[PDB]
Design a protein around this ligand. Structure first.
Ligand SMILES: Nc1nc2c(ncn2[C@@H]2O[C@H](COP(=O)(O)OP(=O)(O)OP(=O)(O)O)[C@@H](O)[C@H]2O)c(=O)[nH]1
Ligand SMILES: Nc1ncnc2c1ncn2[C@@H]1O[C@H](COP(=O)(O)OP(=O)(O)CP(=O)(O)O)[C@@H](O)[C@H]1O
Ligand SMILES: c1cc(CNc2cc3c(cn2)[nH]c2ccccc23)cc(Oc2ccc3c(c2)OCO3)c1
Ligand SMILES: Nc1nc2c(ncn2[C@@H]2O[C@H](COP(=O)(O)OP(=O)(O)O)[C@@H](O)[C@H]2O)c(=O)[nH]1
Ligand SMILES: [Ca+2]
Ligand SMILES: [Mg+2]
Ligand SMILES: [Mg+2]
Lengths: 427, 62, 338, 437
């Protein structure tokens, strides 16, 4: 059951390359695409993400997209650049100017059909494709505007395939330009319709984590992306390694998403670790469980205690007692059952994988479908309205053909989404 | 108390003990249920592909 | 941190138990339909016993014994005695009673009554208290559902000063191990009007109910005499004690009743656990013989005692199962060898 | 002699079927290559074991089994397992992508594309049958295939085989070994649609098997392998009368006669004893009285419930090993005095007893100790309705919010089927209570 991976834009390609770097190591694939591991467990599901080529060489089923060449040139000269199939580098030259309109309507439109040719070519070589995944930001123009155009066109050509995303939500604390609330609001509308799972990475939670917990005084985007790739590896562990039970993306989505529009998840990771800084003391199951449920370990800057969990998935990695896991997981729910909806019975599920990640004997990944995520969308809406009530910076968009009405529309849909979350918070 | 119908063979035996006495739809309708749900599917798929077509028009217009 | 839910709001006793539990700092209340409770204080109707003991990692305890209604319903209690050999139609401490259905053992009650009228013996019955069988057989058909007929005790022990009537109420706690605990403090729900042996139709001296008595308050505060006084009155007037003359029989009746249905209701090996508080109602005749009248499965306590009993329930029924970070009960056990 | 065809649907059904057919081979002395030395009816016969096995001219004994999954990976493990030679490819039917725990997907969307092929491979086995009794159908309530496709298969089998009996073994969902959350929906939908096509259904609650494995086999956190070997022991106890010489429950028809007076109420409760850890060093072997009395302990039941608070309509005791009628009746008489065993007023208070002298076979390398005598009790008690009550309440909680419904509607299913099935269950719950109080 193959997955096709797509990464779009500055942020999308930088976190995306880290993903392939991290899991390529987990599967014993070197920067040449050659396997040099010890176990057979790390090749049993390798077809999920890698195509097998001549010479017993493994090639990521990855398509790399940008409207400017700078970041993708840096990928090929990068730590694992050689592994990617060179025909899958699809890029323009003009850039998107941190402008959703350019990525979605004018510059991206020019380029999108070329991208879809590669998607189709990678799909037709799939025995049974089980879905697509995208990495991208919502604050820029390529990943935000063109990424959501791709998603719309993928759903047109593959309407029954699962589509999941890691979407970096913008924040003023870690910010490139002032129009990010505009691009994020326009993108969220598209995600609400055309994705099955969206893992919301709020770039300020990554910042607070890097500063307040890893004691990094001036974190870079690189430090921020180490946390993201840890989560990306964690949430895909049970598809990449033989384990307790195997569910395809559809079955996983069915049991996590009770309502089609409420598919924006809160990811988290324990233990939280910085690059290089070596961790020597392994965590106990109680420590992993407290930390992965703690607000400080969440990567969407939302207090889980301000909402209620609709569903929760937790993925523990390493050698540990699944009995101790069961008891500790059941202890968290039974101790804070007022933050779980009583009308979805047994809505906290768990999986264990014996293969730990690089550098940790033991880790846990948290996937929370909480109504508290509305706080993230309330933040974007406030920032959106603060400029939009004065029509500020809109000339960048009206000059690409957009009307004020599309912004009003985008604003209203996200205020609906916020109110939808509030309905189930009080039920 | 009362042991009846005792029956014995080389493999085993069986009996009964009483402690006290007392005091489809057709292949037609099936085919139709299924096809009335397959049409329900393509109506929903068509509305999506239509909704995606209105979007495409808006992209051309912008 | 143990957790619990409340599903009976009319419950005076467990309203206080809820207060005790919250004021320990180690119990927390969830809401009625939150199924992640350690403890349930359930409704009296259609309590969903089938949904308990299926929550992984939660020891679950409910304050009711499934099946205990066969003891706490007059029609079923009559049945249980004359049907269980361990109680046996010849039972010495339960009044002669029959089950009569409105238009069954009405024929059987005609015959057992006829040589109680045409046998030259004392003769009164209760459901209405009359002395003629038709005065009653016309009333049960006239009111609706099944009623119990029962021989009426025409010679009740009478409390002087007053030549009055009374009934005794004892509270019994059965824990999850089926230990039978008798609360040491009972009460007499006494009449204040002298018993009138002739005219049964005025039922203010025949019926001792605390409500139906509301000469209220003349002799005792609340038509409620506690055990210290009733013991004293027995000593002064009859030379005996409460323990010897009455209580021994009370403990015998309590134990016989609860041991009879133990196999049917015990939760020893079950996936959930039960305790329950019962109120037994007794009735002493002039020869100091104790009679069992009814078993109330959802009893209310008396005002001086709520503090003590509701604490006792918490100590031996709940904290025994959910321990936290001299006794007021008498344990009823007996194994005579034969 | 009359043949029985076994249908294993979905992950749970397939893996339980493997557990059962492996145990069957050990019990009948059939080797993994299908050779049965002791059978001198080379290439044929009408012995009792031929009910479940057919024979080839080369003396191969082949299960009358069809495995069907909407996803290859579980049944591929059959095609490569120790008993790969036993079945032939025409019996192993797989799809491409599964029902994703979605009843509507297994019944309507994906089921439509495979139902005809399955009925064809079933009709290829029924053609080899001199006289067919019916089918034993193994599946889960929770899975999309186990719930959705099973009910579609059962509707059609009642059409293609109207005279022919149908029994299920059904896995009732338990949170402890399930990563799904929509199982209450699938359970009620499949029960409503299968109920009037099934003559007798043996439910097994994974919660009960799980706790039995923990308490009595000293297994910290059971796997499906631990659960399935225990389940197959019980299934084998139920089907032994169909595979061995005897006079009790000799055809599928007798199962409903003896166990199911009321057609709708066709869910007998199974209780099994003794379960003894093979790793237990010293074990005092248990008597006929002890194992029989253990049949009335809720902790030994396939579904945790309290039979003391319901009424029996039928009760069979099935013994394997060193048991004789005298000891059975002495044990029953003792148990009658001590325990609450109350029948409906229009059924006799009694037990049908079948004894097979061969003590239960255990898988070499399994978790079960060999025992001198074991028993499985099949009792039709209204107390099993507690399981319907738990499942229906969970269904009500989610459906009040329409949680997850959009998945089912999006495969072509109407919201009204949810309410139809739920009220059928509400009717069933009252049928049980009319009879039981
Ligand atoms: N006892 C037992 N139960 C199982 C086994 N495998 C799966 N289950 C149960 O089946 C339920 C989920 O349905 P599945 O049978 O796995 O799914 P399916 O039948 O393959 O149908 P799909 O959803 O299309 O995959 C869970 O509640 C599991 O407890 C097994 O091997 N043994
Ligand atoms: N056989 C009998 N002989 C004499 N008096 C009797 C009797 N049976 C009942 N009584 C009287 O009837 C009165 C109330 O009867 P009963 O106990 O049935 O009412 P009740 O059920 O409302 C009490 P509670 O309020 O505690 O539930 C008692 O005071 C008792 O003295
Ligand atoms: C594939 C699978 C997943 C995991 N989805 C999931 C898991 C579980 C679940 C429901 N859903 N319920 C569970 C119960 C127990 C255990 C696990 C689950 C997420 C994903 O998203 C992306 C998107 C872009 C990326 C990316 C991953 O990596 C690099 O770029 C892609
Ligand atoms: N985590 C992370 N976020 C980034 C990175 N680069 C840009 N961003 C975020 O994405 C937004 C800008 O979008 P951009 O990446 O330029 O979109 P593009 O035009 O598609 O490349 C800003 O709000 C940044 O916070 C990165 O390397 N890591
Ligand atoms: Ca033969
Ligand atoms: Mg930028
Ligand atoms: Mg499956």
């Amino acid at each position: 059951r193959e997955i096709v991976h797509i990464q779009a834009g500055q942020c999308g390609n930088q976190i995306g390359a880290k993903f392939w770097e991290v899991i390529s190591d987990e599967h014993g694939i070197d920067p040449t695409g050659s396997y040099h591991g010890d176990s057979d467990l790390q090749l049993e599901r390798i077809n999920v993400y890698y195509n097998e080529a001549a010479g017993n060489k493994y090639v990521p089923r990855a398509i790399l997209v940008d409207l400017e060449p700078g970041t993708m040139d840096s990928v090929r000269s990068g730590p694992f650049g050689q592994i990617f199939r060179p025909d899958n580098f699809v890029f323009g030259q003009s850039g998107a100017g941190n402008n959703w309109a350019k990525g979605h309507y004018t510059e991206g439109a020019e380029l999108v059909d070329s991208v879809l040719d590669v998607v189709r070519k990678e799909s037709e070589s799939c025995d049974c494709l089980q879905g697509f995944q995208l990495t991208h930001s919502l604050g820029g123009g390529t990943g935000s505007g063109m990424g959501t155009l791709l998603i719309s066109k993928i759903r047109e050509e593959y309407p029954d395939r699962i589509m999941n995303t890691f979407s970096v939500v913008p924040s003023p604390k870690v910010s490139d330009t002032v129009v990010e609330p505009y691009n994020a609001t326009l993108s969220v509308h598209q995600l609400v319709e055309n994705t099955d799972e969206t893992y919301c990475i709020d770039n300020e939670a990554l910042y607070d984590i890097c500063f307040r917990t890893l004691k990094l005084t001036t974190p870079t985007y690189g430090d921020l992306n180490h946390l993201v790739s840890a989560t990306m590896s964690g949430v895909t562990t049970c598809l990449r390694f033989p384990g307790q039970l195997n569910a395809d993306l559809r079955k996983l989505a069915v049991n996590m998403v009770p309502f089609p529009r409420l598919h924006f998840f809160m990811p988290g990771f324990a233990p939280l670790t910085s690059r290089g800084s070596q961790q020597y003391r392994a965590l106990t199951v109680p420590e992993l469980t407290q930390q992965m449920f703690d607000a400080k370990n969440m990567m969407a800057a939302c207090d889980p205690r301000h909402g209620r969990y609709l569903t929760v998935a937790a993925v523990f990695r390493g050698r540990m007692s699944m009995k101790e896991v069961d008891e500790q997981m059941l202890n968290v729910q039974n101790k804070n059952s007022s933050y779980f909806v009583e009308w979805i019975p047994n809505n906290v599920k768990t999986a264990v994988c014996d293969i730990p990640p690089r550098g940790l004997k033991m880790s846990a990944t948290f996937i929370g479908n909480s109504t508290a995520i509305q706080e993230l969308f309330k933040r974007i809406s406030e920032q959106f309205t603060a400029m939009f009530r004065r029509k500020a910076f809109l000339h960048w968009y009206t000059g690409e053909g957009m009307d004020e009405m599309e912004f009003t529309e985008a604003e209203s849909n996200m205020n609906d989404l916020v109110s939808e979350y509030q309905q189930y918070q009080d039920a | 108390m009362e042991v009846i119908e005792l029956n014995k063979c080389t493999s085993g035996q069986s009996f009964e003990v009483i402690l006290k006495p007392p005091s489809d739809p057709s292949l037609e309708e099936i085919q139709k249920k299924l096809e009335a749900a397959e049409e329900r599917r393509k109506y929903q798929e068509a509305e999506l592909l239509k909704h995606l077509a209105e979007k495409r028009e808006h992209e051309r217009e912008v | 941190m143990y957790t619990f839910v409340v599903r009976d709001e009319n419950s005076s006793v467990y309203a206080e138990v809820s207060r005790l539990l919250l004021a320990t700092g180690q119990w927390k209340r969830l809401r009625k339909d939150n199924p992640r409770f350690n403890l349930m204080l359930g409704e009296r109707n259609r309590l969903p016993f089938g949904r308990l003991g299926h929550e992984p990692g939660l020891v679950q305890l409910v304050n009711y014994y499934r099946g205990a209604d066969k003891l706490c319903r007059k029609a079923s209690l009559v049945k249980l005695i004359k049907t269980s050999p361990e109680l046996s139609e010849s039972c010495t401490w339960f009044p002669e009673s029959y089950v009569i259905y409105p238009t069954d053992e009405r024929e059987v009650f005609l015959a057992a009554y006829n040589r109680r009228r045409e046998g030259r013996e004392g003769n009164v019955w209760i459901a209405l208290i009359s002395s003629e069988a038709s005065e009653l057989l016309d009333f049960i058909d006239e009111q609706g559902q099944v009623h119990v007929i029962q021989k009426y005790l025409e010679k009740p022990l009478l409390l002087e000063p007053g030549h009055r009537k009374f009934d005794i109420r004892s509270w019994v706690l059965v824990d999850h191990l089926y230990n039978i605990y008798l609360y040491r403090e009972g009460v007499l729900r006494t009449s204040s009007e002298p018993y009138n042996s002739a005219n049964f139709q005025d039922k203010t001296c025949h019926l001792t109910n605390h409500c139906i008595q509301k000469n209220y308050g003349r002799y005792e505060e609340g038509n409620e005499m506690f055990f210290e006084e009733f013991n004293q009155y027995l000593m002064d007037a009859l030379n005996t004690t409460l323990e010897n003359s009455i209580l021994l029989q009370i403990k015998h009746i309590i134990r016989s009743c609860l041991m009879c249905i133990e196999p049917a209701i015990s939760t020893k090996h079950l996936h959930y656990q039960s305790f329950q508080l019962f109120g037994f109602d007794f009735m002493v005749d002039e020869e100091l013989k104790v009679w069992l009248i009814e078993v109330n499965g959802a009893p209310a306590c008396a005002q001086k005692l709520y503090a003590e009993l509701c604490q006792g329930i918490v100590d031996v029924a709940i904290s025994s199962v959910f321990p936290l970070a001299t006794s007021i009960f008498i344990k009823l056990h007996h194994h005579h060898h034969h | 002699m009359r043949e029985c065809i076994s249908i294993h649907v979905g992950q749970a059904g397939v893996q339980i079927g493997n557990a059962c057919w492996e145990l069957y081979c050990l019990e009948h002395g059939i080797q993994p290559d299908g050779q049965m030395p002791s059978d001198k009816t080379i290439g044929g016969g009408d012995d009792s074991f031929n009910t479940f096995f057919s024979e080839t001219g080369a003396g191969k004994h082949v299960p009358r089994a069809v495995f069907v999954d909407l996803e290859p990976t579980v049944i591929d493990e059959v095609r490569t397992g120790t008993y790969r030679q036993l079945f032939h490819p025409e019996q192993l039917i797989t799809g491409k992508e599964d029902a994703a725990n979605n009843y509507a997907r297994g019944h309507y969307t994906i089921g439509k594309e495979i139902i005809d092929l399955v009925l064809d491979r079933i009709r290829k086995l029924a053609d080899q049958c001199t006289g067919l009794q019916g089918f034993l159908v193994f599946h889960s309530f929770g899975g999309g295939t186990g719930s959705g496709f099973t009910s579609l298969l059962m509707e059609r089998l009642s059409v293609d085989y109207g005279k022919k009996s149908k029994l299920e073994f059904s896995i009732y969902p338990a949170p402890q070994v399930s990563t799904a959350v929509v199982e209450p929906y699938n359970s009620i939908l499949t029960t409503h649609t299968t109920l009037e096509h099934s003559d007798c259904a043996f439910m097994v609650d994974n919660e009960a098997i799980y706790d039995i494995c923990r308490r009595n086999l000293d297994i910290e956190r059971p796997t499906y392998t631990n659960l399935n070997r225990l389940i197959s022991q019980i299934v084998s106890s139920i089907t032994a009368s169909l595979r061995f010489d005897g006079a009790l429950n000799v055809d599928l028809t007798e199962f409903q006669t003896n166990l199911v007076p009321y057609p709708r109420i066709h869910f007998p409760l199974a209780t099994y004893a003794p379960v003894i850890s093979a790793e237990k060093a010293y074990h005092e072997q248990l008597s006929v009285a002890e194992i029989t009395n253990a049949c009335f302990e809720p902790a030994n039941q396939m579904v945790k419930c309290d039979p003391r608070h319901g009424k029996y309509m039928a009760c069979c005791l099935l013994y394997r090993g060193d048991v004789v009628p005298k000891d059975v009746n002495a044990a029953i008489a003792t148990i009658k005095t001590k325990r609450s065993i109350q029948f409906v007023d229009w059924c006799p208070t009694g037990f049908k007893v079948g004894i097979n002298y061969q003590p239960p076979t255990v898988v070499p390398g399994g978790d079960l100790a060999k025992v001198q005598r074991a028993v499985c009790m099949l009792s039709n008690t209204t107390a099993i309705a507690e399981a319907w009550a738990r499942l229906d309440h969970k269904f009500d909680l989610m459906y009040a919010k329409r949680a997850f419904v959009h998945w089912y509607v999006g495969e072509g299913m109407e919201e009204g089927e949810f309410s139809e099935a739920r009220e059928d269950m509400a009717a069933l719950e009252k049928d049980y209570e009319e009879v039981g109080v």
